[PDB]
Amino acid sequence: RLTELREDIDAILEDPALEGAVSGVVVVDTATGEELYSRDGGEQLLPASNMKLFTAAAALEVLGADHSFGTEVAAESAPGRRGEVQDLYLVGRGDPTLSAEDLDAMAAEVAASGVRTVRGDLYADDTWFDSERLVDDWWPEDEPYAYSAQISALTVAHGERFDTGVTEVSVTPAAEGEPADVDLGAAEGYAELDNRAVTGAAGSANTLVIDRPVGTNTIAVTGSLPADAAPVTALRTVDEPAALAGHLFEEALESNGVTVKGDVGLGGVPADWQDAEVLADHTSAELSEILVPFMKFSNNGHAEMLVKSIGQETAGAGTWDAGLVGVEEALSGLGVDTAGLVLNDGSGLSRGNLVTADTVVDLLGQAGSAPWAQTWSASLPVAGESDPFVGGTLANRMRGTAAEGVVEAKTGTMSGVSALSGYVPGPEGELAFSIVNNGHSGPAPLAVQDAIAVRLAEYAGHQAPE
Ligand SMILES: *C(=O)[C@H]([C@@H](C)O)[C@H]1CC(SCCNC=N)=C(C(=O)O)N1
Numbered sequence: 001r002l003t004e005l006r007e008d009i010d011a012i013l014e015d016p017a018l019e020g021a022v023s024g025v026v027v028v029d030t031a032t033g034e035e036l037y038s039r040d041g042g043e044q045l046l047p048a049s050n051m052k053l054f055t056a057a058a059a060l061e062v063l064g065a066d067h068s069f070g071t072e073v074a075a076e077s078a079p080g081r082r083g084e085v086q087d088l089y090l091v092g093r094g095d096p097t098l099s100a101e102d103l104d105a106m107a108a109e110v111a112a113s114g115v116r117t118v119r120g121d122l123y124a125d126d127t128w129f130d131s132e133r134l135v136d137d138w139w140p141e142d143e144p145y146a147y148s149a150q151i152s153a154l155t156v157a158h159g160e161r162f163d164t165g166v167t168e169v170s171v172t173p174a175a176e177g178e179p180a181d182v183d184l185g186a187a188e189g190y191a192e193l194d195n196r197a198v199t200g201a202a203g204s205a206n207t208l209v210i211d212r213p214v215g216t217n218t219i220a221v222t223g224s225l226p227a228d229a230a231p232v233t234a235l236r237t238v239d240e241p242a243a244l245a246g247h248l249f250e251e252a253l254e255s256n257g258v259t260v261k262g263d264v265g266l267g268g269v270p271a272d273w274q275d276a277e278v279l280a281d282h283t284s285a286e287l288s289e290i291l292v293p294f295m296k297f298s299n300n301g302h303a304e305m306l307v308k309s310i311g312q313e314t315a316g317a318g319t320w321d322a323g324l325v326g327v328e329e330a331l332s333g334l335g336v337d338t339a340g341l342v343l344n345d346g347s348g349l350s351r352g353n354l355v356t357a358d359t360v361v362d363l364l365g366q367a368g369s370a371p372w373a374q375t376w377s378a379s380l381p382v383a384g385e386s387d388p389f390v391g392g393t394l395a396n397r398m399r400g401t402a403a404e405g406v407v408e409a410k411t412g413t414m415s416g417v418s419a420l421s422g423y424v425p426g427p428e429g430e431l432a433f434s435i436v437n438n439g440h441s442g443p444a445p446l447a448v449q450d451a452i453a454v455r456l457a458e459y460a461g462h463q464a465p466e
Pocket residue numbers: 048049050147297298300347348349350393410411412413414
């Protein structure tokens with residue numbers, strides 16, 4: 001029975017999709033510590049988004065499942081009979097799920113607190129983290145796209161997935177030959193618009209491109225949208241998420257009857273402020289709930305923000321240097337051997353990250369017996385589950401196989417790198433596996449990863465739902 005499995009995995013790994021690739025594959029029975037399968041287990045490889053496994057476990061160690069995140073609004077003193085204040089500060093302390101609606105609710109509080117007029121300026125304070133927006137070795141060409149959003153302590157999260165530091169651009173065709181209509185979403189009045197796009201004939205080819213040119217705050221739109229096309233939406237990053245948050249907050253104040261007379265910019269609450277008056281605040285959901293959209297959809301912004309929150313909690317430093325040491329120390333304190341680990345970010349976007357499949361499985365075992373094991377487990381994509389908040393990045397993989405509804409695993413893919421690691425619960429014991437592939441030259445070997453996870457599900461005693 002055990003010899004069949006090794007033969008079957010051996011054969012799966014001969015697939016031509018893995019030509020010239022190195023593949024770390026480890027499978028362990030977690031009830032006994034029995035190594036069921038091991039190849040290139042100690043080989044150092046890029047993890048891509050499997051890096052998030054390390055980040056999530058450390059966040060739960062350092063911050064706790066009950067940890068929540070605060071945002072507040074501050075003036076030098078409370079408002080008067082006249083209901084006036086001078087400068088106002090919106091202060092972000094690392095909430096990765098702060099919505100436009102949370103801004104409106106804080107704006108209503110400011111009004112309710114007696115403010116009618118902000119006579120001075122509105123400043124967006126993100127000083128709880130440092131102002132290092134991107135990791136050194138991240139690629140500049142990626143910057144326009146949600147997964148490369150700038151990192152800040154104060155950022156507005158979009159939608160129920162809470163994509164941070166982005167705006168939703170919507171392009172709608174007009175009559176043929178008329179410019180396409182571009183709607184910048186939340187960044188209206190914040191980001192600049194360079195719209196060169198036209199509406200093409202009905203049935204013409206869609207060549208529409210939406211860019212943010214490197215080192216600018218301009219949404220540049222080119223190409224041609226067919227007159228008969230459905231409108232196109234895309235998430236695009238902005239420069240300085242905190243200043244977009246400031247912009248949206250100004251609007252929310254105005255919309256709740258509070259007149260802002262001055263300008264909007266970045267700035268930290270002055271040191272010379274004696275006893276700041278907190279005029280409004282907001283508390284995020286607890287980390288256990290935040291772990292769901294973070295890990296199910298592999299949210300890079302959430303990961304980096306949790307690293308810096310780790311740096312804040314361990315060292316008073318909202319920094320990658322500090323946060324990444326904190327991740328490593330949390331993992332060690334958990335009993336994980338971190339010798340094979342090189343940590344350059346929390347999300348796994350960085351090509352400077354390294355793991356080994358053995359280190360991954362080690363972590364899977366330690367996390368499985370931690371006090372927070374269930375919270376952690378619930379955050380992982382579940383093979384083949386059609387509800388996006390349940391199936392996550394595995395929603396349309398492994399359907400109608402023994403893995404469906406059973407395998408819980410984290411994904412990860414970029415150019416030349418793909419990974420799948422997690423658990424296979426069986427009638428007998430929970431299996432832990434890690435599959436890390438580097439160096440394949442075609443599509444990410446997802447079918448190969450599926451075949452192994454499916455084989456493990458079967459071995460554990462499972463059968464495909466019909
Ligand atoms: C992790 O590997 C990357 C991260 C580096 O940006 C993200 C992107 C993806 S793949 C495309 C997103 N959803 C999949 N349809 C993942 C992922 O784990 O799938 N994480």
